[PDB]
Design a binder for this molecule. Structure first.
Ligand SMILES: CCCCCCCCCO[C@@H]1O[C@H](CO)[C@@H](O)[C@H](O)[C@H]1O
Ligand SMILES: CCCCCCCCCO[C@@H]1O[C@H](CO)[C@@H](O)[C@H](O)[C@H]1O
Ligand SMILES: CCCCCCCCCO[C@@H]1O[C@H](CO)[C@@H](O)[C@H](O)[C@H]1O
Ligand SMILES: CCCCCCCCCO[C@@H]1O[C@H](CO)[C@@H](O)[C@H](O)[C@H]1O
Ligand SMILES: CCCCCCCCCO[C@@H]1O[C@H](CO)[C@@H](O)[C@H](O)[C@H]1O
Ligand SMILES: NCCc1ccc(Br)cc1
Ligand SMILES: NCCc1ccc(Br)cc1
Ligand SMILES: NCCc1ccc(Br)cc1
Ligand SMILES: NCCc1ccc(Br)cc1
Ligand SMILES: NCCc1ccc(Br)cc1
Lengths: 310, 310, 310, 312, 310
């Protein structure tokens, strides 16, 4: 007959989410309730009903009594887990109450940058029983598992928190318990506005003003610089993210400005060429297209992407 | 009956405050006084009245005597806590004197960048009893808790230090002790002056000089460069801070220069356009307005923000 | 007679591959099966058939019974190995079942940047027996060793995973077991396209447009800038990689643009020189060569490398 | 026992891994040596057993706990973060003289930093070793012939002027006066880097700029000095990062603003010369111009003595 | 009588050489052979001749038997040493065989950047006996100490490996053993060529082309830019190295281009000045000197340094 293990997990802090390395880091507390009849003991009346053990001696106790503990791993843990507290409280009955406080990093392979920066992502911690269900089944320790109030994370904000149970088959042939803490969060886009969109629009608009000079050479020299600017903005954003083998929304928007700004150069080159072959008057007539093409192309291009991605 | 636990905490050093990751790091000493009658002992004459234990053996002693120790966590601790000393002194009377020296990082989610760089911030360490008040109540260990003299931090300087007790309900249903060390500090604005304001004003002023040349094309080319400069200064500052979903004061000041410098372009474009359509004399008349718009706009804009934020 | 040790190793995560420091990092689980007759035990009915030990006490047990354990090292391990679980299960038969979960970095000196970024690389973990084959032989633990599904790595993608055994002679004169987990992976070229090729082609193309202006001075000033741009792109890429004593494909492609763009300068200098010595008409004739030389040389140069490297 | 026992503290820095002026700390590999005679620890030895017993710190402390003997607990007051230990080894003599060796790499807070004269300055580095227990229980004495700095420190920027050791009290955990052993050293910066990477360039920019005054294009001088400004604004960011977010003004801090003020005026001035040209007074400008050509060099060297007097 | 301790040390990997912090990091295995008669033991026939101990219990054994172990430090170790294996094999005869596998950083104060980047450097690990020679003398464990095959290091390549004994006087008055593993290595100049020399020569050469335009203003504007470029290249290289109080070869080469490029500016200023005072014809005569000065100056200057440094 297999004994129930009551798995509770609360994330107190999100220390940060490194989206480039596709992981996040949390301060968190794991809580386990587990009745083991064999661990139960007798007290004299007036001697305490509850024994408080360091994890160190509590396991050395279990080893001595040849009792199996419900050994568990965090499947998506990365690197070290700095433990704060690992503390056991045992009762007359042989109910074990375990607390594990830790800061640690976790894999989140559920990262989809397709709609970056307008994206919503799945973050989750997996807690697996090493031992199969035929020995230990995990049950939800109700009234504990979730996320806290002061997470300290300013970019992401969390949509929903859910806890669910399931199997794995990592070390066993047999089905084995896995407690899961999931959360979805999505980005506060202020940064992306204030530092990327606003500037790129400011560059584009203030550039368009200088079309009313009707120096075609100046427009060419301007758009040529704009190109390098965007090629930089392309490097800014490229670093935020991993070396993805797919094309971001952001990725597309940049190549947008590329294509346009490439043509702005080519077009004004041709207008300027007419001026150079005694057809200045034509250019100046023709020119009106070029002045109104500029802004339409960027706003035709705005709907082009917005439909392709939404 | 619940036994009193006397919690003292002194921050010797502030190793630094990482405002981007919304945490700070301190060298600090935790001091606990706790009378446990059961631990009291008799000595032979010539054998010491105070027994000095490593935390390691002191707990192994408590486990052996089935005595519960007032287990505590630092709630806002991040990552590892490098311990220097963990030393126990047990008096005849059964008074435990504990010392914990450590360097460690702590969450400070009390970060409000609304008035950055003119801001005052709350930094605090929480020390929680894991066990409820029905078992242990924390009392302020007088004559210890506070901040030192040589903190070593050059940017922030501390306004006020306060200590107080209160409850939590982290692992218990029952109310539980929490000792709090708060401090407020505010930024030394010298850096922000010397590296950000002075330059931006220098750029703006030295730019305005070149208005007295009365080349409109040159002013357009100048203000266009100024734009990119500010777009950079925008990236400098953006990195100091997190990816906030709210707009800094600083954030606004930058977009200020943006809006203005955008118009300086638009305006001089129009003056230059008049020159290009045989209305050079008009431009040169209007020009006088344009020369005295530059300085007013930046100083109209100075009061615009200084009213909006204060 | 030497006893068989059944070595399984599964990489759950690739935390990343630092190609500059010629190493990779993995979350992984090591599994060892090893029958030791001496460890075998009898149980009372109602006492467990399988005894579960912490590695700590399991070795202290082996030391006490003067039994030699099949000590192993990871030969290509770098720095610390953060252990998650080190857990032993001893059956009545005296079969030891060991599990070691860890995050760790490993050397991969099998790095050939000759065809970077179009390259396929060998990543491997070596597990050596410290003790010779005369004492312990390693055997492939079937049904476990390999790579998982959720590796979390976005740039590389894995072609093939193989396991095989072999000898070493690291500390012994005698032949000694070595279990090897190899994998090959190759790069997703999207990044290299979107951030390096597309820009460099965009710069080159939009530059060629400005040839139809037939300002030779402008072409010289342009190609001179292009040079510095490529000299930067040269620094971008240089950092991705180590300080290799061999020439990358990428390395060559950069020098290509160098040589060409150097020529464009020299050539247009000469065209411009003719203009300056009353031979403007000649230049304008010869110019047609220069206009079509530009694009040919970049695409002659494309086949030059694509033949030299393939 | 027979009053307070003397404890002989020796500390030698074998190397300085580096000095991070931005975090106002330094990191050293060092060996701490303590001599401490305890009558109670003295033991009788059977012939064929060594006269000196060699213990790991862990066993030696577990032994002290067992024998209910209090050891002279000590902390490094200015230690920062983790201290990796190389060796912790105890040798117990028949006489009961305890010999402890602690080898470690560690970072130490140093609030002694004064950037007022940066980069031309000397700074004070110190490690504090505080006894937790008061002076009435234990007094620290200088273990002579050991304390100091080594030969191969490995540090190329700083070079050390003087090493001094002395003892004093603290009152950290006790009401009672308590021992504190101090290892101080002063070092000062090698100016070559600051020359080769900051001064030489800034002078090169300034001088090569002044050459282009002999062109007598006023527009070109304006465009040049405007660029010079941005250059210095960069050099301002280079240096700003070397240092913390100080609330005071460095020497270097001042020197940068110097170039600012000057280069701002060079613009303003040539703007005015150019303005005369634009209002048919080209001849005047060309007269005045001679003042302007000699002003640039004077102002930079008037400005050199301005600071060198204000700061020295 | 003092007992011999057989010290072997093999570097398996060079994880890297941080030339800025004047240290290097290696994966390595320390091997010690040491006969202690007291550690010898008797076995029953059929009970093992060799006892295999964790370092942990092996020392607790030595402490119990009041035997002194040949305590050693790595003198030039920096920071933490991550240990892989610390394993003892005790024979009946009382021969201890010790293995210490570790990744660790080591000081190399033997750094001479005088001829950087054409330099050859000394890297060494010191292993000191804490105890004097009157108690333990170190002897070279032969057939093991040296460097491995797959070091993984791409910039440096190792010239020679030598091992030898010597004294120290670190904690003792008495002479004390020190085993030394030295190696020399020298740099692969490919990086320095491909990223620094080639570009600087490309800039200089492509600049010289624009002399054949015979625009003196353009040459001034060009050389002025070249200056800033080199001032950057000066910052690139400055960071590779520490804040050395001595002048590199590289250091000199840069100041070379400085001095020259400063004069190119001055000289063309003077040519241009002649044009401005009706002496255009003279300038155009003198010009031939200036055109052939530039190339000679850089190649006079190339031999100047190649003499002073070689
Ligand atoms: C740049 C957006 C602002 C537009 C306003 C018109 C003047 C622009 C400022 O100078 C221009 O900046 C480009 C970007 O670097 C350069 O390529 C170009 O040669 C230069 O003339
Ligand atoms: C530059 C701010 C300081 C004001 C000095 C006035 C003289 C002009 C200095 O050079 C300017 O630098 C910008 C920055 O990129 C260029 O874009 C711009 O076209 C260029 O004219
Ligand atoms: C720069 C090395 C390549 C030289 C090719 C000759 C044409 C000039 C190329 O662009 C130039 O870049 C320089 C560096 O900032 C500026 O001084 C210069 O005014 C600018 O036009
Ligand atoms: C730059 C590739 C875009 C080609 C479009 C033609 C118009 C000019 C583009 O700006 C150029 O940018 C360089 C910065 O490195 C400068 O050196 C160069 O003098 C400048 O004119
Ligand atoms: C540049 C300092 C070196 C002095 C050399 C004198 C020749 C002119 C070099 O080009 C200048 O470079 C500045 C970069 O700051 C540009 O902003 C400015 O428009 C331009 O005039
Ligand atoms: N490192 C996991 C140890 C452990 C597991 C379960 C329980 Br209940 C107590 C301790
Ligand atoms: N980890 C518990 C440490 C502790 C020791 C003694 C006292 Br009194 C309070 C706390
Ligand atoms: N430090 C790991 C030693 C070990 C190796 C294999 C087995 Br099976 C048990 C223990
Ligand atoms: N944690 C080190 C404690 C200690 C150090 C030196 C001596 Br002598 C005794 C004790
Ligand atoms: N910490 C290492 C101590 C030691 C030294 C030598 C040998 Br042989 C065994 C142990």
């Amino acid at each position: 007959e297999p004994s129930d293990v009551f798995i509770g997990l609360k994330i107190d802090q999100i220390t940060g989410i490194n989206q480039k390395e596709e992981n996040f880091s949390v301060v968190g507390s794991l809580r386990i309730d587990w009745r083991q009849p064999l661990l139960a003991f007798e007290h004299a009346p007036g001697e305490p009903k509850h024994r408080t053990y360091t994890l160190a001696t509590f396991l050395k106790l279990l080893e001595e009594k040849q009792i199996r503990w419900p050994a568990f791993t965090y499947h998506n843990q990365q690197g070290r887990m700095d433990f704060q507290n690992r503390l056991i409280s045992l009762s007359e009955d042989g109910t074990v109450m375990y607390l594990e406080r830790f800061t640690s990093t976790f894999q989140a392979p559920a990262f989809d940058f397709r709609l970056f920066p307008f994206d919503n992502q799945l973050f989750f911690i997996h807690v697996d029983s090493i031992f199969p269900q035929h020995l230990f089944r995990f049950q939800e320790m109700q009234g504990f598992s979730g996320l806290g109030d002061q997470l300290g994370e300013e970019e992401w904000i969390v949509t929903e928190v859910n806890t669910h149970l399931t199997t794995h088959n990592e070390f066993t042939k047999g089905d084995a318990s896995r407690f899961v803490l999931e959360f979805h969060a999505e980005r506060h886009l202020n940064y992306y506005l204030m530092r990327i969109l606003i500037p790129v629009l400011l560059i584009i608009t203030v550039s368009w003003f200088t079309f009313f000079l009707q120096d075609y050479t100046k427009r060419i020299d301007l758009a040529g610089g704009n190109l390098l600017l965007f090629i930089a903005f392309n490097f800014t954003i490229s670093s935020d993210l991993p070396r993805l083998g797919y094309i971001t929304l952001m990725d597309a928007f940049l190549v947008g400005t590329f294509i346009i700004t490439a043509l702005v150069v080519l077009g004004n080159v041709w207008l300027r060429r007419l001026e150079n072959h005694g057809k200045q008057a034509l250019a100046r007539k023709l020119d009106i297209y070029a002045i109104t093409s500029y802004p339409l192309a960027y706003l035709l291009g705005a709907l082009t992407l917005w439909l392709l991605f939404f």
